[PDB]
Write a protein that binds this DNA or RNA. Structure first.
Ligand SMILES: [Mg+2]
Ligand SMILES: [Mg+2]
Ligand SMILES: [Mg+2]
Ligand SMILES: [Zn+2]
Lengths: 196, 190, 161, 134, 205, 52
RNA sequence: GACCCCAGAAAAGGUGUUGGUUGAUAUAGACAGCAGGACGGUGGCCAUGGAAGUCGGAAUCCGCUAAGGAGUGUGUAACA
């Protein structure tokens, strides 16, 4: 079945490369399956998104290169976790609708945080049994109105560094928005053209 | 099966001078000299380039057992290069449940005294290997820095401290006291 | 200070969960050091203190007395940072010079206690003499010949009954 | 914020339950509905499934108004009192309607598969009705 | 209670079957020789696997029972109680005598029957398991476990014959198609092309 | 009152190891066969049990 | 370890090394490492005090897909 599935990928990529003259190569960050489901459903009206092995992409491209030259321009750009999005709509509107649907990604434990986040001093609303986590992270907190209350704003994690499990689960419990990100366009390809 | 040849090459950085006195490699760099003889292994050591300064280890007609000595020699030489360029710094975090551990550094960081390990009266005294310097941290609460050039000696000193801090007749899964090597890195981080 | 606050938080959450509301017939029951409903010391050595004593004697150092000690205890305890170099309380852990400020509780309650402990336990006789003279501690006879932890018990028993 | 955060879900159904279930266990979050609230909530939620019947509730500072999601086993057992393709065909109209789909015809395939708790053989080589639903 | 198997490991005696000259033999330990789905047709289980012994020795009936149960538990746990058939192709027809010492000495040393062993030869099949093709791994593992209850060395063979029958798997299909075999029970009936023509009329009709 | 960051470091050397079933030797967690002569380098290993 | 009788050994193991057999993956990118993802119907049906993939009896499907098992484990009373 592996050979048949690879063959199916070949026919799929050649058919869609022939069908859509406008394709953008997009870099996939630490994006989840649910994020991808949301993106596909958002773009279900106009665009179609495919991703796979870069080597498979490049091999199919080189195989179809005689039938359609000028696709060799995409060849020294299939690097890293990237992929194709096929569209027929205008550049800035597709770019707008791709930057518009960026999920507020939760802080996954063990990952690097790209954003510097400081939590405020507010009525958290949590029950007075989650205080052990505030004690573990090193925040002095008091009970106000029968709920947890932080006296001062405190930073939690800097930029470009690893995150801890307790630090992450506290933010999940507070349900605040951590660093958020999504798939980002690397380049575009309009009928034999390369742009930034 | 005697493979005709197995060879491996290590690149020498520009500011490092390596001399071969037989199988005795002398690596000289900004941090000093590391010397080590590989006379227990029969290999063909040679220096090739003039700007690259490659060092090749060759072993001819080697069976399975001695075919693994080539990478061992290359890794030891790379360790010598790392030691004389960036040095080795082992950071050990002394962890204790209840009793704080009093670590006293004696003369020029060559002697370490562990006083209150598990709250007892016997004082552990550990002598670091020659050329290895010990320190008590300033950016960290309970941390020891072991700096040196010979990775062998540095890590052996770290193991000496760690195995001096040993719990006996107790559930070691419960009693987690002692000093453990939190991380292994370099000086100057270059 | 962190451990003290941990104990305070744990007691507070206990009484919050297993008690009635702040609007309850008993009222507000959560204990705050600024309210002076939590104390420190050691009963074995015969000495103890609260937030009231240090605040009162610092006000005397600096009707109206109750007001002064009451609103000074709030600066005595909390996440408030006091610079001994500045001589005025601050609400920022970073000075305009960028130097970190020790918090007020450790700065002007725990610092003298730590200093007298170290002087007595390490037998620094001139240090203990200076500390007694600065703290106007009144020792008695038969206490002036002892040393170590019994001298510590004596000095602490007289200074913080 | 509707004066309360009551978007929690409840998994009680069939028999009354009331305090036997976790209705009083989650009650102190709002404290308003309590033993009257779970009584009327169950009175409304008796039908739309006699199973566990996961649902959501909305609080009006005294009472609760219930919305019942279209869970697979929930709607299957509720409609139950054979393939019965007609009843699932009409039952996909009011569905949650996302199902990570590309077409509406796949939806009846997915639920004719999940109703396997055989009707897999119609889904395997279905050729009629994949356009009929939308 | 029973003497160790090493005392009777070897075929040091002429065969001594339970007959009118050897009366009062106790019953053997093994009683059921076919397990699993015994009723399955021949075409259901196209894989046969054998535990071929390497030692011309004696295998005790108790050991045969234990190995049979060891194979049965694993095969049931791995392939269900309806996915395999086991046939133990050794029967304990040899009687071993024992001279109990309580006259005294070696006088009148001839011994009363004690137990039954099966004499097996080099290359002889001890156990056979027939099953579906994809369960080859499970069959080999089951026979591998069952080997541990026998003294000598045994080998696992994946027989070329279809199931338990005496024809190769690759010729079985077209042989049944061209009617040289008719399936019945767990095996087949070979139909030679000589005999009455009325049998051939029953066939091809 | 060991902080969890140090708990992991201590467990890495003390608890999180593999044990040979035949000679009880303390081996690294990814070991397949025992390193000691007296057990035939047998590959029968079990994780060192936790305290929980 | 070191020679018929013969003066000593077995089943079972070894990621010590060597040879051999059979099978498989792979420049359409093996393998191992480091790094991402690891989803929706569905917290699938019985089972119950709670078993949401992971105590069990049965079933083994679908769509999104590049892939994600109504699940190989660790774990929770269940979750996480
Ligand atoms: Mg290395
Ligand atoms: Mg003991
Ligand atoms: Mg005889
Ligand atoms: Zn072992």
């Amino acid at each position: 079945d592996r050979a048949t599935w690879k063959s199916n990928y070949f026919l799929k990529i050649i058919q869609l490369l022939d069908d859509y003259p406008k394709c953008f190569i997009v870099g996939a960050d630490n994006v989840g399956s649910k994020q991808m489901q949301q993106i596909r459903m958002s773009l279900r009206g106009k665009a179609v998104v495919l991703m796979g092995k870069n080597t498979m992409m490049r091999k199919a491209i080189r195989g179809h290169l005689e039938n359609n030259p000028a696709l060799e321009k995409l060849l020294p750009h299939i690097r890293g976790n990237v992929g194709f999005v096929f569209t027929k709509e205008d550049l800035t509107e597709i770019r707008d609708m791709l930057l518009a649907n960026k999920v507020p990604a939760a802080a996954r434990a063990g990952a690097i945080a790209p954003c510097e986040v400081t939590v405020p001093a507010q009525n958290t609303g949590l029950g007075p049994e989650k205080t052990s986590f505030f004690q573990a992270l090193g925040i002095t907190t008091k009970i106000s109105r029968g709920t947890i209350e932080i006296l001062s704003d405190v930073q939690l994690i800097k930029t470009g560094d690893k995150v801890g499990a307790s630090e992450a689960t506290l933010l999940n419990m507070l349900n605040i928005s951590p660093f958020s990100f999504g798939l980002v366009i690397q380049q575009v390809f309009d009928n034999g053209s390369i742009y930034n | 099966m005697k493979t005709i040849l197995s060879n491996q090459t290590v690149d020498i950085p520009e500011n490092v001078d390596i001399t071969l006195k037989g199988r005795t490699v002398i690596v000289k760099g900004p941090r000093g000299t590391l010397r080590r003889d590989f006379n227990h292994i029969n290999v063909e050591l040679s220096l090739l380039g003039k700007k690259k300064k490659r060092l090749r280890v060759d072993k001819w007609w080697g069976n399975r057992k001695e075919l693994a000595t080539v990478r061992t020699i290359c890794s030891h030489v790379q360790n010598m290069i790392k030691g004389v360029t960036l040095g080795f710094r082992y950071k050990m975090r002394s962890v204790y449940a209840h009793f704080p551990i009093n670590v006293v550094i004696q003369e020029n960081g060559s002697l370490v005294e562990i006083r209150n390990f598990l709250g007892e009266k016997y004082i552990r005294r550990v002598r670091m290997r020659p050329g290895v310097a010990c320190s008590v941290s300033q950016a960290q609460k309970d941390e020891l820095i072991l700096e040196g050039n010979d990775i062998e000696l540095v890590s052996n000193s770290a193991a000496l401290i760690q195995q001096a801090t040993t719990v006996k007749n107790k559930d070691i899964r419960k009693f987690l006291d002692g000093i453990y090597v939190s991380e292994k890195g370099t000086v100057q981080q270059a | 200070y962190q451990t003290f606050q941990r104990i305070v938080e744990n007691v507070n959450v206990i009484i919050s969960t297993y008690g009635e509301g702040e609007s309850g017939p008993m009222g507000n029951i959560m204990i705050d050091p600024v309210l002076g409903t939590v104390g420190f010391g050691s009963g074995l050595h015969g000495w103890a203190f609260t937030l009231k004593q240090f605040a009162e004697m610092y006000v005397a150092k600096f009707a109206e007395r109750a007001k002064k000690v009451e609103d000074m205890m709030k600066k005595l305890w909390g996440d408030r940072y006091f610079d001994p170099a500045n001589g005025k309380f601050s609400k920022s852990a970073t000075s305009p010079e960028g130097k970190k400020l020790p918090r007020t509780f450790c700065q002007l309650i725990l610092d003298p206690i730590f200093k007298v402990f170290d002087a007595i336990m390490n037998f620094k006789k001139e240090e203990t003499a200076k500390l007694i003279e600065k703290l106007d501690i009144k020792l008695d006879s038969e206490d002036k010949d002892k040393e170590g932890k019994p001298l510590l018990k004596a000095v602490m028993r007289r200074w913080l009954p | 914020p509707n004066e309360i955060k009551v978007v929690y879900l409840r998994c009680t159904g069939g028999e009354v339950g009331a305090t036997s279930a976790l209705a009083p266990k989650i009650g102190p979050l709002g404290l308003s509905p309590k033993k009257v609230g779970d009584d009327i909530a169950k009175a409304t939620g008796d039908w739309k499934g006699l199973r566990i019947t996961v649902k959501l509730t909305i609080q009006n500072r005294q009472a609760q108004i219930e919305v019942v999601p279209s869970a697979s086993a929930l709607i299957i057992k509720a409609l139950k009192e054979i393939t019965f393709d007609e009843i699932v065909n009409i039952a996909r109209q009011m569905r949650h309607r996302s199902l990570a789909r590309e077409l509406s015809g796949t939806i009846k395939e997915i639920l004719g598969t999940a109703q396997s708790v055989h009707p897999h053989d119609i889904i395997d080589d279905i050729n009629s009705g994949a356009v009929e639903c939308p | 209670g029973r003497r160790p198997a090493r005392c009777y490991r070897y075929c040091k005696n002429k065969p001594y079957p339970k007959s009118r000259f050897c009366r009062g033999v106790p019953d053997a330990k093994i009683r059921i020789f076919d397990l699993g789905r015994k009723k399955a047709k021949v075409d259901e289980f196209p894989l046969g696997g054998h535990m071929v012994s390497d030692e011309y020795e004696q295998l005790s009936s108790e050991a045969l029972e234990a190995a049979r149960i060891c194979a049965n538990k694993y095969m049931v746990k791995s392939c269900g109680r309806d996915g395999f058939h086991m046939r133990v192709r050794l029967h304990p027809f040899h009687v071993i005598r024992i001279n109990k010492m309580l006259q005294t000495g070696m006088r009148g040393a001839f011994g009363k029957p004690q137990g039954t062993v099966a004499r097996v030869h080099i290359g002889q099949v001890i156990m056979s398991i027939r099953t579906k093709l994809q369960n080859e791994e499970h069959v080999i593992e089951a026979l591998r476990r069952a080997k541990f209850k026998f003294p000598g060395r045994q080998k696992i063979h994946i027989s070329k014959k279809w199931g338990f029958t005496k024809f190769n798997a690759d010729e079985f299909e077209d042989m049944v198609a061209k009617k040289c075999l008719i399936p019945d029970g767990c095996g087949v009936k070979y139909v030679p092309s000589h005999g009455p023509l009325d049998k051939w009329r029953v066939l091809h009709s | 009152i060991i902080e969890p960051s140090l708990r992991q470091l201590a467990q890495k050397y003390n608890c999180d190891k593999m044990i040979c079933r035949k000679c009880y030797a303390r081996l690294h967690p990814r070991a397949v066969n025992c390193r000691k002569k007296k057990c035939g380098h047998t590959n029968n290993l079990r994780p060192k049990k936790k305290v929980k």
